[PDB]
RNA sequence: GAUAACCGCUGAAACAUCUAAGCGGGAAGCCUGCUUCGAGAUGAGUGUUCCCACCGGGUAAGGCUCCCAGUA
RNA sequence: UUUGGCACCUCGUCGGCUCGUCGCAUCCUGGGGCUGGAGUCGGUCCCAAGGGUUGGGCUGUUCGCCCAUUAAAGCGGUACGCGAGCUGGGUUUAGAACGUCGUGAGACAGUUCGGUCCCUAUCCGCUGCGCGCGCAGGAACAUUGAGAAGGGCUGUCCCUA
RNA sequence: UCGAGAGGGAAACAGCCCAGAGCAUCGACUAAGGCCCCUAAGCGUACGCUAAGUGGGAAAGGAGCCGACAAUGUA
């Protein structure tokens, strides 16, 4: 499959927030 | 105007007609500005509008 | 309707032989001893029910909120609590002990417990779907669900359609299991059948909901 | 009972009555029971 | 000059009790929705809630004209296929009268995020007793004008 | 309503009380009550009156009077419905207040007597149902006759006393 | 428990009428009853017990993190 | 839901498998009226969509015929449901042959043998699992139930006889 | 009339009803269409009809009614 639309800035950043490291 | 007029027991339907028959035409812009702040003045205007109406309002003109 | 109940712990299965020499595969349930810790009522709590506390736990692993809830009924702290939704909860009393022999031979019970877990079960194993055949040239879909809806009308997958998800490890209630024998010395219950959950689980045994 | 939009008397004893918004014919000869619908 | 728009503190909500004893259901809802929406006082604005709390006692004795009691349904679909479940008002008004009056008033109000805030000011009860006795509610009769 | 116009007569020994629209008649056999539907009114001369001449008013006129007359007869003399049993082996026995029926079934039928309704057994093919309320007496008799409808080939089952069943020539 | 077709009691409008006021019976169907989820039911509920009235911060009851594991 | 007419949107047809979902014009099961219904079984009609509705031979086949059963082997809509789910047997490419047509290149709702079925799921949707916050003191435990999902099939023999 | 036509009404709905937008206006009167609540204005006054939610779809025909009857979910 292929992305139907360019992802809106809000939606892109909602997700990348989840890609965070944990404090040891 | 309709809310304030119904507080004094006259519907907006006929409060306007009475005002016409008293030649006291005063814009709605400011006729609604009296109801909020100066209730007495609006109360004094419904009195005029009620007495300027015909006795029986539904009889043939 | 009146419902007697008791917590147990499935221990395993074995077989017995009734007087007519008919193999009867039974499951050994170590039910009891369990004590009433609280009795609900229409006025205090709205409905009629009865807690019973079964288990063995040293007083050092019980936090104070529960350690004070047990001291109201004056019973040593147990580890598992449950309610039996009954209709005669006014006949119980705090601290009353419900022994294993609440049931007698022949009575039918409704055993309940957490079924065994199965992980993220696939389509076939969890809904008994069929496949697309191993042979005759099936391209990488030997175990696929198949289709999941129609074309542009409705253009949407219906809610409640059967997919693959986490199976098992959910509450299950087997019904009208027969209580073969009640060995009151050890406090066991020989029940003809297969109660839910793995060995060591916390089963509940209450009287037949049906047939009353 | 015969279900027909056209409900008519067949003999004299037939009585045309209106029950529950539906016109039916009641008669001693059970064959003449008729209901409109 | 600019026409007065009420600020948060110009509103002084009151409490009205509408005894619905043998009063038409539709005329109960319209009267309750007028008060709820705050559309009877000169401080009305279309973007702020100015209405008054409306308690409703005797919500089980709403008179219903004609064959409505046995013909009018109340449909409710769940999302799953074949999930439509309807209820005759004979059944609905028998054991859940409050849930039928509150549904009627809900329809007679905006379906936006403010109409749901207005609708929270309407308490419906089946008896003659409402717990809201500390709010000093004022009985509210239903009257017409000339 | 030609029926409604007719005045009502109250035999001696009957106490009639009219409290608004509800009439309570006390007789030697019991007491009955009824709320008359509006706008029909009743006055003691008993004469039933109607406000207007509307279609519905006329119907209610006659209906209301007929109910009232029934009570007066019902509390004075009462209603008895006779039922006869025809067939082979069909008998009726009275067990206290209940009736045992054997209409050719695998098990016997025990019909209970509703409050205010008594049963009389003259014979094991003839019985009557006595009572004060006409509707209830008729209801019980109909229910007892529903146990075994009368066959159209041999007229087997319970039937009303003197009720002429049409017989079909079995082919 | 209420109902469909249907079967009736009483009964007019006008003797008859299961109906126009009323009252019953009557389906694997409808609501319950059985199993499971279920207060994000933002209307966010209820119960028993515990902590105790400190100075942005330290804490009580009680948690979380970490380690050994499975009944996961 | 057929064979058609219009040409208004847009320059892999079918069949099978998998998975559903809905309508009732009901095949079975449930209730009932009438019967040219003695009984068993039927015919017709009325109510009824909860569940159920087998396996094979022939053909690509839908269809259809047949075999053995079954309480029954229902009719339809959903892009004649469903190929970003599978097959690829017929059908709409290129090879070759037969019949017929054509002077010939070739053609035929004639036939015959062979003949590449791509994609890492962004959005909605669906199946499961977490994180955050909320629910005006903070917690542990057990629960009411507004609502929702699941299940609803049926046969043979004995007694009554 | 649209095409090349904005604005109001018919729930949405180029072609239907009203009406032809130079620009501003927190004044007034009206057109089609409306005046129980959503939503501006009548729970208008008076007489009469309808009992079918007819109004809020339909025929031959039968005695406002029946005739009336498809598929995602009231529709």
PDB file of C-alpha atoms (C1' of nucleotides) in Angstrom, chain C residues 40 47 51 63 65-66 81-83 85 126 129-132 136-141 144-153 156-166, chain H residues 16-22 77-88 117-120 124-130 138-145 148-151:
ATOM      1  CA  UNK C  40     -24.425  -6.979  52.216  1.00  0.00           C
ATOM      2  CA  UNK C  47     -28.492  -5.853  47.063  1.00  0.00           C
ATOM      3  CA  UNK C  51     -18.412 -12.290  50.897  1.00  0.00           C
ATOM      4  CA  UNK C  63      -1.721  -4.081  53.785  1.00  0.00           C
ATOM      5  CA  UNK C  65      -6.700  -1.298  54.713  1.00  0.00           C
ATOM      6  CA  UNK C  66      -7.414  -5.009  54.247  1.00  0.00           C
ATOM      7  CA  UNK C  81     -12.182 -12.502  48.483  1.00  0.00           C
ATOM      8  CA  UNK C  82     -15.363 -12.902  46.429  1.00  0.00           C
ATOM      9  CA  UNK C  83     -19.118 -12.421  46.735  1.00  0.00           C
ATOM     10  CA  UNK C  85     -24.906 -13.250  44.825  1.00  0.00           C
ATOM     11  CA  UNK C 126      -9.572 -18.970  18.076  1.00  0.00           C
ATOM     12  CA  UNK C 129     -12.080 -20.880  10.706  1.00  0.00           C
ATOM     13  CA  UNK C 130     -11.154 -23.035   7.747  1.00  0.00           C
ATOM     14  CA  UNK C 131      -8.129 -22.480   5.537  1.00  0.00           C
ATOM     15  CA  UNK C 132      -7.528 -22.318   1.801  1.00  0.00           C
ATOM     16  CA  UNK C 136      -3.706 -26.789  -5.606  1.00  0.00           C
ATOM     17  CA  UNK C 137      -1.597 -23.637  -5.616  1.00  0.00           C
ATOM     18  CA  UNK C 138      -2.592 -21.367  -2.730  1.00  0.00           C
ATOM     19  CA  UNK C 139      -0.335 -18.317  -2.525  1.00  0.00           C
ATOM     20  CA  UNK C 140       0.716 -17.607   1.055  1.00  0.00           C
ATOM     21  CA  UNK C 141      -2.833 -17.697   2.449  1.00  0.00           C
ATOM     22  CA  UNK C 144      -5.922 -16.524   6.303  1.00  0.00           C
ATOM     23  CA  UNK C 145      -9.311 -15.323   7.563  1.00  0.00           C
ATOM     24  CA  UNK C 146     -10.597 -14.891   4.023  1.00  0.00           C
ATOM     25  CA  UNK C 147     -12.819 -11.906   3.311  1.00  0.00           C
ATOM     26  CA  UNK C 148     -14.037  -9.442   5.916  1.00  0.00           C
ATOM     27  CA  UNK C 149     -16.939  -7.710   4.202  1.00  0.00           C
ATOM     28  CA  UNK C 150     -18.653  -6.665   1.013  1.00  0.00           C
ATOM     29  CA  UNK C 151     -17.854  -4.060  -1.618  1.00  0.00           C
ATOM     30  CA  UNK C 152     -18.625  -0.325  -1.623  1.00  0.00           C
ATOM     31  CA  UNK C 153     -21.892  -1.112   0.159  1.00  0.00           C
ATOM     32  CA  UNK C 156     -17.037  -0.853   6.115  1.00  0.00           C
ATOM     33  CA  UNK C 157     -16.110  -3.861   8.238  1.00  0.00           C
ATOM     34  CA  UNK C 158     -19.029  -4.744  10.494  1.00  0.00           C
ATOM     35  CA  UNK C 159     -18.445  -4.376  14.209  1.00  0.00           C
ATOM     36  CA  UNK C 160     -18.130  -7.651  16.067  1.00  0.00           C
ATOM     37  CA  UNK C 161     -16.594  -9.451  13.101  1.00  0.00           C
ATOM     38  CA  UNK C 162     -14.331 -12.341  14.057  1.00  0.00           C
ATOM     39  CA  UNK C 163     -10.578 -11.558  13.955  1.00  0.00           C
ATOM     40  CA  UNK C 164      -7.460 -12.924  15.677  1.00  0.00           C
ATOM     41  CA  UNK C 165      -6.727 -11.608  19.166  1.00  0.00           C
ATOM     42  CA  UNK C 166      -5.649 -12.617  22.643  1.00  0.00           C
TER      43      UNK C 166
ATOM     44  C1'   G H  16     -15.282 -22.263  -6.642  1.00  0.00           C
ATOM     45  C1'   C H  17     -13.079 -21.515  -1.576  1.00  0.00           C
ATOM     46  C1'   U H  18     -12.987 -18.215   3.124  1.00  0.00           C
ATOM     47  C1'   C H  19     -15.726 -14.958   5.729  1.00  0.00           C
ATOM     48  C1'   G H  20     -19.927 -12.681   6.668  1.00  0.00           C
ATOM     49  C1'   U H  21     -24.373  -9.501   6.810  1.00  0.00           C
ATOM     50  C1'   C H  22     -29.524  -8.362   5.642  1.00  0.00           C
ATOM     51  C1'   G H  77     -30.054  -8.209  -2.080  1.00  0.00           C
ATOM     52  C1'   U H  78     -25.229  -6.737  -0.690  1.00  0.00           C
ATOM     53  C1'   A H  79     -20.381  -3.450  -7.618  1.00  0.00           C
ATOM     54  C1'   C H  80     -25.164 -10.515 -10.662  1.00  0.00           C
ATOM     55  C1'   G H  81     -21.158  -9.341  -1.787  1.00  0.00           C
ATOM     56  C1'   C H  82     -16.314 -10.891  -1.228  1.00  0.00           C
ATOM     57  C1'   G H  83      -8.984 -11.629  -6.446  1.00  0.00           C
ATOM     58  C1'   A H  84      -4.519  -4.536  -2.073  1.00  0.00           C
ATOM     59  C1'   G H  85      -8.290 -12.458   0.655  1.00  0.00           C
ATOM     60  C1'   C H  86      -6.825 -17.321  -2.472  1.00  0.00           C
ATOM     61  C1'   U H  87      -7.533 -20.175  -7.168  1.00  0.00           C
ATOM     62  C1'   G H  88      -7.389 -19.105 -12.699  1.00  0.00           C
ATOM     63  C1'   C H 117      -2.727 -12.865 -11.488  1.00  0.00           C
ATOM     64  C1'   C H 118       2.291  -7.194  -8.702  1.00  0.00           C
ATOM     65  C1'   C H 119       1.975  -4.090  -3.705  1.00  0.00           C
ATOM     66  C1'   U H 120       6.424  -3.103   3.043  1.00  0.00           C
ATOM     67  C1'   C H 124     -11.340   5.468   7.880  1.00  0.00           C
ATOM     68  C1'   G H 125     -13.076   0.467   9.469  1.00  0.00           C
ATOM     69  C1'   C H 126     -12.475  -4.096  12.325  1.00  0.00           C
ATOM     70  C1'   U H 127      -9.730  -7.570  16.176  1.00  0.00           C
ATOM     71  C1'   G H 128      -6.625  -7.389  20.646  1.00  0.00           C
ATOM     72  C1'   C H 129      -3.008  -4.694  24.056  1.00  0.00           C
ATOM     73  C1'   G H 130      -0.973  -0.489  26.480  1.00  0.00           C
ATOM     74  C1'   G H 138      -5.208  10.313  49.103  1.00  0.00           C
ATOM     75  C1'   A H 139      -5.409   4.753  48.921  1.00  0.00           C
ATOM     76  C1'   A H 140      -6.557  -1.098  49.151  1.00  0.00           C
ATOM     77  C1'   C H 141     -10.313  -4.465  48.311  1.00  0.00           C
ATOM     78  C1'   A H 142     -15.547  -6.115  46.446  1.00  0.00           C
ATOM     79  C1'   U H 143     -19.250  -4.927  43.800  1.00  0.00           C
ATOM     80  C1'   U H 144     -24.756  -2.381  41.664  1.00  0.00           C
ATOM     81  C1'   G H 145     -25.947  -2.384  36.450  1.00  0.00           C
ATOM     82  C1'   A H 148     -23.587  -4.353  24.862  1.00  0.00           C
ATOM     83  C1'   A H 149     -22.053  -9.198  23.019  1.00  0.00           C
ATOM     84  C1'   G H 150     -22.921 -14.796  23.128  1.00  0.00           C
ATOM     85  C1'   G H 151     -26.683 -18.894  23.045  1.00  0.00           C
TER      86        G H 151
END
